[PDB]
Curated annotation (Swiss-Prot), chain A:
Name of this chain's protein: Ryanodine receptor 2
UniProt tissue specificity: Highly expressed in heart, lung, cerebellum and brain. Detected at lower levels in adrenal gland, stomach, thymus, esophagus and ovary.
Protein purpose: Cytosolic calcium-activated calcium channel that mediates the release of Ca(2+) from the sarcoplasmic reticulum into the cytosol and thereby plays a key role in triggering cardiac muscle contraction. Aberrant channel activation can lead to cardiac arrhythmia. In cardiac myocytes, calcium release is triggered by increased Ca(2+) cytosolic levels due to activation of the L-type calcium channel CACNA1C. The calcium channel activity is modulated by formation of heterotetramers with RYR3. Required for cellular calcium ion homeostasis. Required for embryonic heart development.
Gene disruption: observed consequences: Embryonically lethal. Embryos die at about 10 dpc, due to defects in heart tube development. Cardiac myotubes display enlarged rough endoplasmic reticulum and cytoplasmic vesicles that contain high levels of Ca(2+).
Origin: domain of life: Eukaryota
Entry domain remark: The calcium release channel activity resides in the C-terminal region while the remaining part of the protein resides in the cytoplasm.
Family per record: Belongs to the ryanodine receptor (TC 1.A.3.1) family. RYR2 subfamily.
Assembly mode: Homotetramer. Can also form heterotetramers with RYR1 and RYR3. Interacts with CALM and S100A1; these interactions regulate channel activity. Identified in a complex composed of RYR2, FKBP1B, PKA catalytic subunit, PRKAR2A, AKAP6, and the protein phosphatases PP2A and PP1. Interacts directly with FKBP1B, PKA, PP1 and PP2A. Interacts with FKBP1A and FKBP1B; these interactions may stabilize the channel in its closed state and prevent Ca(2+) leaks. Interacts with SELENON. Identified in a complex, composed of FSD2, CMYA5 and RYR2.
Subcellular location: Sarcoplasmic reticulum membrane
Modified how: Channel activity is modulated by phosphorylation. Phosphorylation is increased in failing heart, leading to calcium leaks and increased cytoplasmic Ca(2+) levels.
Section covered of the full-length record: 2316 to 2507 of 4966
UniProtKB/Swiss-Prot annotation, chain C:
Summary of the knockout phenotype: Embryonically lethal. Embryos die at about 10 dpc, due to defects in heart tube development. Cardiac myotubes display enlarged rough endoplasmic reticulum and cytoplasmic vesicles that contain high levels of Ca(2+).
Annotated domain remarks: The calcium release channel activity resides in the C-terminal region while the remaining part of the protein resides in the cytoplasm.
Domain of life per record: Eukaryota
Known role: Cytosolic calcium-activated calcium channel that mediates the release of Ca(2+) from the sarcoplasmic reticulum into the cytosol and thereby plays a key role in triggering cardiac muscle contraction. Aberrant channel activation can lead to cardiac arrhythmia. In cardiac myocytes, calcium release is triggered by increased Ca(2+) cytosolic levels due to activation of the L-type calcium channel CACNA1C. The calcium channel activity is modulated by formation of heterotetramers with RYR3. Required for cellular calcium ion homeostasis. Required for embryonic heart development.
Protein name (Swiss-Prot/TrEMBL): Ryanodine receptor 2
Tissue-by-tissue expression: Highly expressed in heart, lung, cerebellum and brain. Detected at lower levels in adrenal gland, stomach, thymus, esophagus and ovary.
Subcellular location: Sarcoplasmic reticulum membrane
Post-translational modification: Channel activity is modulated by phosphorylation. Phosphorylation is increased in failing heart, leading to calcium leaks and increased cytoplasmic Ca(2+) levels.
Subunit and partners: Homotetramer. Can also form heterotetramers with RYR1 and RYR3. Interacts with CALM and S100A1; these interactions regulate channel activity. Identified in a complex composed of RYR2, FKBP1B, PKA catalytic subunit, PRKAR2A, AKAP6, and the protein phosphatases PP2A and PP1. Interacts directly with FKBP1B, PKA, PP1 and PP2A. Interacts with FKBP1A and FKBP1B; these interactions may stabilize the channel in its closed state and prevent Ca(2+) leaks. Interacts with SELENON. Identified in a complex, composed of FSD2, CMYA5 and RYR2.
Family: Belongs to the ryanodine receptor (TC 1.A.3.1) family. RYR2 subfamily.
Length: 167, 400, 192
């Protein structure tokens, strides 16, 4: 994990240009642009590679890598110094509000539909990243996160009778 | 070939090629009043000289990563690559560290570099790496080597960030080459001898007077005037001078006779300029020409040697003392000498005794310029006086 | 210098470079083994292996300069051998103190003392053709004033353990407990 963070930060071009650089802001605008590109077929191949879905998968994979690359659950991080430094680097690279906003998108719950877009698995990477780099230890933070990113998705999941195309 | 020892004053310069033009930008720190650093123009020193006084740091300790982490979990050495150094600001006495806040919205991931008082933590330490494949870790560093400074805490490079007006060095992940120009080798600095970059003043042998300007009771245009004065001015802030040499390396060496150097007023921050239609006055930095503001000290009155000394890349030789060293001011352009006048007529002789200093050819064979260095306390007090008066005057107009 | 060829390479300087590399490696492995007074089986093997490697390199250097060949003398003089030998002095001054407080490291101590003997005979072979004002003497006094602290510690070590062969079995300690094989309550020894 340490050498991977070192290599990624030494060559910063590995991160997506929408997240990193003097141009794009971060994951919020990246995800919104990916959603509009996925819905609008004019920015794809006229079984083709959905460019919006591919961008979404790339960012979800990057976030999952960073989350699983986080030092620990503060077992060794409580008494170590380099773990604290790696956690601080991860926190400085990705802002928390961006992560909360991306979690709160409330995808639709669809006669089936096509799942080659914003897959629900993309949110699991963000959840794991929050749990590992930041965690849930503040009452108001936990409550606001549940309000903005979980209740709508929980309702969408609970609103099933027979048409269950997505497990 | 000269190695970088410890407890020596060095300078951190770099080259910046923006808008198809190269420039040599230095690392400077105001110290008092602000924390973050900034850049200084070592190049273009023909009309605007660089404030080298605040671009000087001193290396305290050179420990390895293991030794540093052991001391954190708890001598004239030689600088090696891969080690960790502690850059103490030479003037302010604080220490260079990597700040935590951010100022450039263009770099959403970089940190600032500034000064801090305490030496605790990993922020105030910087690990050294080479900028070439010919030198690996553990080799001894020499003068002129291009170095790379990496933060120990943030693991960021001391990067030269570019901006329209925010030309400020920060802690970014893109490396930048830095050259280390020595000022004082930390070797045996001859006590009682004149050293470059010193803050001192002048006295006479049997007159007990000093070269100074009017106090703050008069306007700035009247303070620009230059004269001699005695009494309590002997211990005063407006009576000190600084020998700002022209070289950017080894400027804090033994100043020898004949070499050029600007005379800076510590209280006003201006230099002794001279335009031939008038006498010498004080003028600011934004138009200080080398030929106009360059002076030297001669040991006699003749013109036997002018262009004899060109460049010495070293500490030099202990020649000019403070007490028993009768110098004579000589301009690099006109070659005139100091003369005391009687500007105060007999009608007001017993009032404020001031004899204006006109620089002329003949002079009087009774000057006897004696050097006298001021303690670090006095120098720090005078410079912080200038800094705070500048900030407070700007604030007064900005509020008015 | 293989005179007769056209692109001669110096093997002596390369040997010095490898010695410097193994010296920095030993120094780092010691900085790792600082504070913890426990040397495991791997901590013993990885030290004995490097001790043997350094001993062989030192013997090779001794054979390079064993004959009074002023060429190799000056080649070692104008090289980076002094950094390696001062690093070895620095690591010895601390290993000698650390390995003596506890048992189960007498083999490591013996191998290290042997390596130190080979190193000192190596740097002594540099003076077999010495002159009253040679450059090698200047370099040697230079490395001495450059590592005065560690060499003072090691001389104190040797003096302290050499002032014991005569301090015990000469005047009184030999007749304190005349029973047989050496038996001491360790309290009469303290006052002794």
């Amino acid at each position: 994990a340490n050498v991977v963070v070192r290599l990624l930060i030494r060559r910063p071009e590995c991160f997506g240009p929408a997240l990193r650089g003097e141009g794009g802001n971060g994951l919020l605008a990246a995800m919104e642009e990916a959603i509009k590109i996925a819905e609008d077929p004019s920015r794809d191949g006229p079984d083709t590679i959905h460019m919006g879905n591919a961008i979404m998968t790339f960012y979800a994979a990057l976030i999952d890598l960073l989350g699983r690359c986080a030092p620990e659950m503060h077992l060794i991080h409580a008494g170590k110094g380099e773990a604290i430094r790696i956690r601080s680097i991860l926190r400085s690279l990705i802002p928390l509000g961006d992560l909360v906003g991306v979690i709160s998108i409330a995808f639709q719950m669809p006669e089936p539909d096509m799942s080659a877009g914003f897959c629900p698995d993309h949110k699991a990477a963000m959840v794991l990243f929050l749990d590992r780099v930041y965690g849930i230890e503040v009452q108001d933070f936990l409550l606001h996160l549940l309000e903005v990113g979980f209740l709508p998705d929980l309702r969408a999941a609970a609103s099933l009778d027979t048409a269950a195309l997505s497990x | 070939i000269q190695f970088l020892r410890t407890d020596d004053e060095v300078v951190l310069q770099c080259t910046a090629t923006i808008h198809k033009e190269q420039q040599k930008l230095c690392l400077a720190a105001e110290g008092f009043g602000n924390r973050l650093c900034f850049l200084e123009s070592t190049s273009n020193s023909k009309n605007v000289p660089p404030d080298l006084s605040i671009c000087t740091f001193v290396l305290e300790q050179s420990l390895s990563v293991r030794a540093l982490q052991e001391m954190l979990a708890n001598g004239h050495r030689t600088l090696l690559y891969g080690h960790a150094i502690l850059l103490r600001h030479s003037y302010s006495g604080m220490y260079l560290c990597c700040l935590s806040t951010s100022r450039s919205s263009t770099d959403k991931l970089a940190f600032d570099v500034g000064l801090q008082e305490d030496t605790t933590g990993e922020a105030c330490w910087w690990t050294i790496h080479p900028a070439s494949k010919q030198r690996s870790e553990g080799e001894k560093v020499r003068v002129g080597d291009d170095l790379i400074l990496v933060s120990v805490s943030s693991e960021r490079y001391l990067h030269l960030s570019y901006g329209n007006s925010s030309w400020h060095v920060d802690a970014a992940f893109q490396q930048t080459l830095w050259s280390v120009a020595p000022i004082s080798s930390g070797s045996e600095a001859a006590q009682g001898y004149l050293i470059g970059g010193d803050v001192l003043r002048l006295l006479h042998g049997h007159m007990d007077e000093c070269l100074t300007v009017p106090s703050g009771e008069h306007g700035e245009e009247q303070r620009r005037t230059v004269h001699y004065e005695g009494g309590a001015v002997s211990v005063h802030a407006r009576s000190l001078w600084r020998l700002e040499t022209l070289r950017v390396a080894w400027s804090g060496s033994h100043i020898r006779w004949g070499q050029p150097f600007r005379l800076r007023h510590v209280t006003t921050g201006k230099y002794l300029s001279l335009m031939e239609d008038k006498n010498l006055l004080l003028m600011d930095k934004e138009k200080a020409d080398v030929k106009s503001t360059a002076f030297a000290f001669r040991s006699s009155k003749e013109k036997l040697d002018v262009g004899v000394r060109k460049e010495v890349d070293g500490m030099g030789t202990s020649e000019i003392k403070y007490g028993d060293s009768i110098c004579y001011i000589q301009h690099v352009d006109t070659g005139l000498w100091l003369t005391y006048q009687a500007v105060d007529v007999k009608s007001a002789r017993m009032g404020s005794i001031q004899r204006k200093a006109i620089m002329h050819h003949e002079g009087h064979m009774d000057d006897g310029l004696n050097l006298s260095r001021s303690q670090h306390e006095e120098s720090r007090t005078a410079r912080v006086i200038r800094s705070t008066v500048f900030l407070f005057n700007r604030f007064i107009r900005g509020l008015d | 210098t293989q005179t007769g060829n056209n692109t001669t390479v110096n093997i002596i300087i390369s040997t010095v470079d490898y010695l410097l590399r193994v010296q920095e490696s030993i120094s780092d492995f010691y900085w790792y083994y600082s504070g913890k007074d426990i040397i495991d089986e791997q901590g013993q093997r990885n030290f004995s292996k490097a001790i043997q490697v350094a001993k062989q390199v030192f013997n090779t250097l001794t054979e390079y300069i064993q004959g009074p060949c002023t060429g190799n003398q000056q080649s070692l003089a104008h090289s980076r051998l002094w950094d390696a030998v001062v690093g070895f002095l620095h690591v010895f001054a601390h290993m000698q103190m650390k390995l003596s407080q506890d048992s189960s490291q007498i083999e490591l101590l013996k191998e290290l003392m042997d390596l130190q003997k080979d190193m000192v005979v190596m740097l002594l072979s540099m003076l077999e053709g010495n002159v009253v004002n040679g450059t090698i003497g200047k370099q040697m006094v230079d490395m001495l004033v450059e590592s005065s602290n560690n060499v003072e510690m090691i001389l104190k070590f040797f003096d302290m353990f050499l002032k014991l062969k005569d301090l015990t079995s000469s005047d009184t300690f030999k007749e304190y407990d005349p029973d047989g094989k050496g038996v001491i309550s360790k309290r009469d020894f303290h006052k002794a």
